[PDB]
Amino acid sequence: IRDFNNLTKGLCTINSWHIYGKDNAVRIGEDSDVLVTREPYVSCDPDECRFYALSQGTTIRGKHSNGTIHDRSQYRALISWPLSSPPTVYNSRVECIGWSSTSCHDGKTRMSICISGPNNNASAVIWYNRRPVTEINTWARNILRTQESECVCHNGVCPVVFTDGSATGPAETRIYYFKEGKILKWEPLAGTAKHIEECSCYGERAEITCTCRDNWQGSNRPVIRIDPVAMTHTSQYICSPVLTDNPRPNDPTVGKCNDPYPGNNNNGVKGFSYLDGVNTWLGRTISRASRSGYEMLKVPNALTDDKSKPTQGQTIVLNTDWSGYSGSFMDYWAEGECYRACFYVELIRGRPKEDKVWWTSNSIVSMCSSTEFLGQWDWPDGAKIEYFL
């Protein structure tokens, strides 16, 4: 659309979740040429939505897929492919090179940010309208990292959070505000979260909100609210005792708002939440211990009340199937009064758990908010690790 976007609506009433799109990438990859991806996200253009993910430069079935469990290699790009098609060697478009990304569209065209390099000489290049325009070196030389999901723009301004430093320590997270590709401004992490890792975001009423990972000492979730106009921000935790990170302790009756709810150490998983008062929904794995299942629970006022519980659920995928990363996205350009809220779930396959195959790849599964209360299905990746042997 020839004019930048504004976030002018609020969320629609989230009463159940319908299916939006699921590629069956791993089921199709026992016989077409699908690339091994990991870390998916889905982000829309004014004209189409498309799945994204980091590639590993090899197909599921080809010999170089052995060891795609390694997060970082100079063979990974951010690639897009049409909704619910597989990332296949032939329909996949490359966006930019490197091992951590984040991309979003500003109303006019799209930005895409790729981070690359060795852990202590890594570098970000912010592409905008498929041309490189800015580069950022590491500020702390320890695996410089950005969102792994859709970033969000308002009036030409798209906040990105980055983190460089350790996911065990204090690390140095830093919020940037780009416009048309250039560094407008940036800010150090302000507010109460201990460590910020890997956020997923959304926008409503001129506010960009983000749910993230406390990989340091938190089983609850640091949340960052950004004012795109003031180019300013806070961090805090989700008050609700329903813990969404994973691994997890049992859920308290009273969680904690301003510090990491403790129990688990140096471990997390990327995840999201829609924080909108009575109409709040928190996604989390069904497993306490590992990436199995995905549940969506209505927990009214979860961000604020430190004693909040579910009033309604929805299982996205059974505990006896596998889950993984999750982040949010919205069709910002979509006719209506409000924003249909949506999310994706990475279905991870292979190693380390299904170790009989030497690879690790995944599937997208994805849902969006239905105001009617629709019946539920649960949505398995679907492949049999035994046909690849």
């Epitope: 306490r288 590992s290 059974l318 199937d321």
Partner: nanobody
Framework: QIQLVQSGPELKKPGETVKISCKAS????????MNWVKQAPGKGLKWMGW????????TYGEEFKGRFAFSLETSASTANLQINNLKNEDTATFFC?????????????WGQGTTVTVSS
């Protein structure tokens, strides 16, 4: 909480087959798979495999493939072990634990056991 009970302890002479049961109180059977652990008076705890109480997919640890069969009576929220062509080597106490996760890496909750004595 979850309260799995197991059948009484049998005596079966070499060659036979025994039905060993786990009946699930506490949770919703289908979203948590059954784990089966053997405890000889020897090694200590051994994993025999899992059962996906959703589809019925069974997984067996190598030493267990073939003479053993995890099965379920879904309806009863029951899981069963079956040792066929019984060896006096199988003389031991078996457990059904409940797999916290997909495949049953952690086993939150264990039944009380069922002791088989293979003997003439």
């Amino acid at each position: 909480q979850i309260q799995l009970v197991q059948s009484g302890p049998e005596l079966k002479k070499p060659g036979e087959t025994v039905k060993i049961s786990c009946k699930a109180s506490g949770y919703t059977f289908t979203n948590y798979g059954m784990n089966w652990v053997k405890q000889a008076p020897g090694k200590g705890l051994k994993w025999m495999g899992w059962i996906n109480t959703n589809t019925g997919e069974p997984t067996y640890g190598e030493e267990f493939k073939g003479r053993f069969a995890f099965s379920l009576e879904t309806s009863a929220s029951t899981a069963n072990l079956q040792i066929n062509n019984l060896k006096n080597e199988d003389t031991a106490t078996f457990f059904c634990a409940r797999g916290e996760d997909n495949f049953g890496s952690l086993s939150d909750y264990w039944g009380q056991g069922t002791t088989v004595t293979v003997s003439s």
